[PDB]
């Protein structure tokens, strides 16, 4: 089975910023600014010296809130009751978001490196998304026709009743249909032909599954030719 | 899948125009009984039923009875009134009356989906444990040291809430207990919050992205409970005759609604019934054969979902006229195909190979995507609400400074609470309305006497001591 | 004809589920499959509370 190789995804330089979305990282910075000023506004409020009872200035408030988010913590801790409320909820904000980061970053490290949407010929039979075709007047077309294996008979039934026709004139036209179908088409061809196409550029074809059967290429003579036995 | 037109049917003539499960089965019946057959569609298009007060069978059964046709290999369900007029073979396929509903869109996780990885009873116990540890830490520290000698340690009731909340949220707190058995309170609570948070953060990304099907109606009992979603069945069918002659109380509630429905819920064909399900935006339900229902579901656009299970078991049978001579070899033929797995093979071939949709072929949907702001928005909502609440309390507190319970007043407060705490506890141990659940009811005390089965397991206001219906 | 009359009235279904399940002696009496993602139970973390 030859299919279009799935696009090789590139991990970005900032791939660590991927588990949360761009709108989330923007709103976290918006939440970081918004909490710090409110903590500043409550703490450096009217006193009734008493104004300087707190150490939570606006530069100190930004530093405490960054310490809370990064889970490291800071020395200053809010002492007034309304100052504790804003410090408490921002802690509750941090616990959910940072854990959602670490759990998704676990998920982005436990990604299965899947390159096979479809696999060996049973999975080809069980799907309708990707069409599969063969070269006309060829042994591969002949093999699926006179077949008794249950999966192969199912594959031949779909190839007969397919619109548009999956059958191709040559292997090169069969390869070209695979490349321009952006991974929605599969083409069934020989293992050594699949090897040579995969080696050559643009190397966008990937051999998938295993050999369905074993066959051979042999030197052919007409029956009753005198040269048949010396060639053999 | 029983009878259908080929892609090239307009050119083709005779038997090749029709193909399908029953068509190939008609080929297998003809070979084993050695006859020649002609495939004809009945002109009316019905499945066969008695007419109302005319006593004429209309459709397929009427085609058999009035001498028009020699055999009916078709989806004809074996029923009592059909058996009386004409013979049936042994059933070639088994089925059930089943419910069809529009496939609901996958529900998004809610606003409060963050508190989902722990259950409701756990979060309540955490809050109760949070209140508990803070009070104990207050009692241990401020307890008559042997003036401000009491006030040397900084653990008041309001600070002890802050230290415990700091320990739970995994944030460093300014204060530390600085006392044996104060440090024991802190250390055990540290071990508490280590395990509880680790259980919380173990799978939080999975819960915030899981998509759950709502499943409005499970089976016929839930279907009867509301008139919001209408339901109907095919006209002149075994399903209509089944609900008509039904004496089961749930099915009795069905047939009353079937007759007294405006506009008429009955559809002349299944294809109109499926089209009515799709275009009614989930306000219509369709009661149909399970074999047809599984076939409609397995093919695209796959916007229909079968719910629950078969209401009853019945069977499709090849039908012959009463007393005919062809039928007894057809009885022989159906038995032979069942033993030779041909009936096994034909059903497995037609349904499974012609699966042409996403739902049947690869039902599983796998994705490992980034979180989006719709997934986590309640925490942003609570934070902005917490910020607004904090400014409000500070403005109120500024009013209080701009403008103390006495000991006798405080003594009044603890006596009201002590009377309340004793009264509420003794009621709770005494009364028996702790839990509402389906439970062992009391038509008879045991559940084993002549199929009691708790008499349909009614809702039961269970108690700590004993259960009560 | 009588087998059909019993089946259509739900009698054969009522006889069937009664004899197997109700006279059966197993404690579970039914089974179901959990979702791959489900919330924790209090019994699963009761040791921490103790």
């Amino acid at each position: 089975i030859m299919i279009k190789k799935p696009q090789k995804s590139k991990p970005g330089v900032f791939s660590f910023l991927d588990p949360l979305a761009y709108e989330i990282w923007m709103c976290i910075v918006f939440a970081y600014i918004g909490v710090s000023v409110v903590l500043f506004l409550v703490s450096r409020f009217s006193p009734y010296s008493s104004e300087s009872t707190n150490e939570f200035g606006i530069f100190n408030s930004l530093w405490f809130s960054l310490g809370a988010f990064m889970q490291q913590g800071c020395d200053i801790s809010p002492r007034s009751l309304s100052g504790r409320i804003v410090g408490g909820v921002w802690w509750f904000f941090t616990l959910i978001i940072i854990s959602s980061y670490t759990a998704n970053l676990a998920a982005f490290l436990t990604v299965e490196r899947m390159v096979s949407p479809i696999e060996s010929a049973e999975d080809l039979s069980k799907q309708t998304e990707i069409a599969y075709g063969t070269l006309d007047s060829g042994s591969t077309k002949e093999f699926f026709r006179r077949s008794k294996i249950a999966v192969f008979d199912k594959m031949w039934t779909y190839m007969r009743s397919a619109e548009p026709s999956v059958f191709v004139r040559t292997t090169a036209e069969g390869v070209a249909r695979v490349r321009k179908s952006k991974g929605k088409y599969a083409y069934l061809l020989e293992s050594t032909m699949n090897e040579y196409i995969e080696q050559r550029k643009p190397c966008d074809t990937m051999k998938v599954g295993g050999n369905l059967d074993s066959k051979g290429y042999g030197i052919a003579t007409p029956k009753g030719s005198s040269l048949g036995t010396p060639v053999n | 899948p029983y009878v259908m037109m080929k892609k090239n049917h307009e050119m083709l003539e005779g038997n090749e125009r029709y193909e399908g499960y029953c068509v190939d089965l008609a080929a297998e019946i003809a070979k084993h009984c050695g006859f020649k057959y002609k495939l004809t569609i009945v002109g009316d298009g019905k499945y066969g039923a008695r007419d109302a007060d005319t006593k004429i069978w209309n459709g397929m059964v009427g085609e058999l009875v009035y001498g028009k046709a020699d055999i009916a290999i078709a989806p004809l369900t074996i029923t009592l009134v059909r058996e009386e007029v004409i013979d049936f073979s042994k059933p070639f396929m088994s089925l059930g009356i089943s419910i069809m509903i529009k496939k609901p869109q996958k529900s998004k996780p809610g606003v409060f989906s963050f508190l989902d990885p722990l259950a409701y009873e756990i979060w309540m116990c955490i809050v109760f444990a949070y209140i508990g540890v803070s009070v104990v830490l207050f009692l241990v520290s401020r307890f008559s040291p042997y003036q401000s000698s009491e006030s040397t340690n900084e653990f008041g009731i309001f600070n002890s809430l802050w230290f415990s909340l700091g320990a739970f949220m995994q944030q460093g707190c300014d204060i530390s207990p600085r006392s044996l058995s104060g440090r024991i309170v802190g250390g055990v609570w540290w071990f508490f919050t280590l395990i509880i948070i680790s259980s919380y953060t173990a799978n939080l990304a999975a819960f915030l992205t899981v998509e759950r099907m709502v499943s409005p109606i499970e089976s016929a009992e839930d279907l009867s409970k509301q008139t919001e979603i209408a339901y109907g069945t095919l006209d002149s069918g075994s399903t209509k005759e089944f609900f008509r002659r039904s004496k089961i109380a749930v099915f009795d509630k069905m047939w009353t609604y079937m007759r007294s429905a405006e506009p008429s819920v009955f559809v002349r064909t299944t294809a109109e019934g499926v089209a009515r399900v799709r275009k009614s935006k989930g306000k219509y339900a369709y009661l149909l054969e399970s074999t047809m229902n599984e076939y409609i579901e397995q093919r695209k656009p796959c916007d229909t979902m079968k719910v629950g299970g078969n209401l009853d078991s019945k069977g499709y049978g090849i039908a012959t006229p009463k007393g005919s001579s062809l039928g007894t070899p057809v009885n022989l033929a159906v038995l032979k195909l069942s033993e030779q797995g041909v009936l096994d093979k034909l059903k497995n071939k037609w349904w499974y190979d012609k699966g042409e949709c996403g739902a049947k072929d690869s039902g599983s949907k796998e994705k490992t995507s980034a979180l989006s702001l719709s997934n986590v928005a309640g925490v942003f909502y609570i934070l902005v609400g917490g910020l607004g609440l904090a400014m409000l309390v500070a403005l109120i507190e500024f009013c209080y400074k701009s403008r103390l319970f006495d000991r006798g007043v405080q003594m009044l407060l603890t006596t009201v609470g002590a009377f309340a705490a004793f009264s509420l506890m003794t009621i709770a141990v005494g009364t028996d309305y702790w839990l509402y659940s389906r439970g062992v009811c009391k038509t008879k005390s045991v559940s084993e006497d002549e199929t009691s089965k708790k008499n349909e397991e009614v809702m039961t206001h269970s108690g700590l001591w004993r259960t009560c219906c | 004809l009588a087998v059909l009359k019993l089946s259509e009235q739900g009698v054969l279904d009522k006889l069937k589920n009664k004899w197997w399940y109700d006279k059966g002696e197993c404690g579970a009496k039914d089974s179901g499959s959990k979702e791959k993602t489900s919330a924790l139970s209090l019994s699963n973390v009761a040791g921490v509370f103790y």
Binding site: - | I131, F143, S144, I157, T414 | -
Partner: protein, 44 residues
């Protein structure tokens, strides 16, 4: 099923036991403040 086979739902008796917990810890907190007050009066 997903909490629906029995649909276990707690009642006012269960909630009153939860309310009995909240009142009992508060009157415990109220009592200790009285004893701290008494020891403070005894010291002075």
């Amino acid at each position: 099923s997903d909490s629906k086979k029995n649909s276990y739902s707690y009642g006012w008796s269960f909630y009153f036991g939860a309310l009995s917990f909240i009142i009992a810890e508060m009157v415990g907190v109220l009592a200790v403040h009285m004893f701290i007050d008494r020891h403070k009066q005894l010291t002075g």
